[PDB]
Amino acid sequence: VDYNAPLNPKSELFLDDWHIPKFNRFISFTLDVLIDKYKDIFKDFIKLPSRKFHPQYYYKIQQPMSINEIKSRDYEYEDGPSNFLLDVELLTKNCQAYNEYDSLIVKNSMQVVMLIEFEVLKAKNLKRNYLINSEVKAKLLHYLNKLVDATEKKINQALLGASSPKNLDDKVKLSEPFMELVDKDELPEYYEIVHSPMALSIVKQNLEIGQYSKIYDFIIDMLLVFQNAHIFNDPSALIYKDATTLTNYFNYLIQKEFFPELQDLNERGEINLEFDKFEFENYLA
């Protein structure tokens, strides 16, 4: 287990210099909410495994970790955000080091980390977590369609420019297997493992009808679609690779095209950017 290596070294959670005010209060508040919401997923990660019954665990694992331990720690200092995230990621790193990779407990450990990091992502971005009004919805829809229509050639052109590989397919939509959920009767194990299923057709319908209140509500469901493929499938699987590619392309669209377009339009007085701040700082109390 490499503690210092982020699971995703290019995530904005690691690249951006962010801090949340009263971060300790944020952390315990947020973790408690998740524990209550996802009781079955989280229950195995609240306490460290007993020393008395787990000798080989404490042989194998250099930095034992639990949600209780994280809740007990201080993160209100410069490197706090990164240390918190790395402490959280130990929850799955240690589990993967100790148990069989395919195990339910390992898949659960990954979803614990994913759900925690989704809450951090929302909180880190209060400054730009605008209300989805008519204008914002229209723009999000275009970017969603751009992602859905993306081919290997287009994505690589966007991400790598002149450094893109040369052969690349410009026909097949990488989105295809993410559009619809698998039939529950054909693959019941999917629903036993993946606890919050999501598919791109569903996210699009949600956006079209106004089910997402704020930008990051939409963003998280999009990330959930791709991350669930990383949970269910082996890293060696082609779909796992495509999930990575689509995650990176989506993040590129949001950061490099979508948010800059909102800023340009706002500066030119062509868009209203507003907030619903309900519970933005609920953790402060």
Q: Give the span between the Cα atoms of 12 and 8, in whole angstroms.
A: 9
Same fold, 11-124 and 125-269: yes
| CATH number, domain 11-124 | 1.20.920.10
Domain ranges of the chain: 11-124, 125-269
Compute and round to an integer the Cα radius of gyration of the chain. 20
Resolution in A: 1.8
Record the tokens describing residue 3, joined without a space: 């503690």
Residue with tokens 């062509």: 270
- What angle do helix axes 134-149 and 200-209 make, rounded to 10 degrees? 160
CA dihedral 180, 183, 186, 192 (to 10 degrees): 100
Question: If you classify domain 125-269 with CATH, what class do you get?
Answer: mainly alpha
Q: Give the span between the Cα atoms of 273 and 285, in whole angstroms.
A: 26
Close Cβ partners of 152 (under 8 Å, ≥ 6 residues apart): 168, 169, 170, 172, 174, 245
**Can you spell out the DSSP letters for the chain?**
--TTS-SSTTSHHHHS----TTHHHHHHHHHHHHHHHTHHHHGGGSSPPPTTT-HHHHHH-SS---HHHHHHS---STTHHHHHHHHHHHHHHHHHHHS-TTSHHHHHHHHHHHHHHHHHHHHHTGGG--B--HHHHHHHHHHHHHHHH--HHHHHHHHHGGGS-SS--SSS-TTGGGSSPPPTTT-HHHHHH-SS---HHHHHHHHHHT---BHHHHHHHHHHHHHHHHHHS-TTSHHHHHHHHHHHHHHHIIIIIIHHHHHHHHHTT--------TTTTTTT-
Q: Give the span between the Cα atoms of 95 and 110, in whole angstroms.
A: 9
Q: Give the span between the Cα atoms of 122 and 216, in whole angstroms.
A: 6
Record the tokens describing residue 181, joined without a space: 């959920």
Residues 73, 31: contact at Cβ < 8 Å? no
Record the tokens describing residue 191, joined without a space: 């629903």
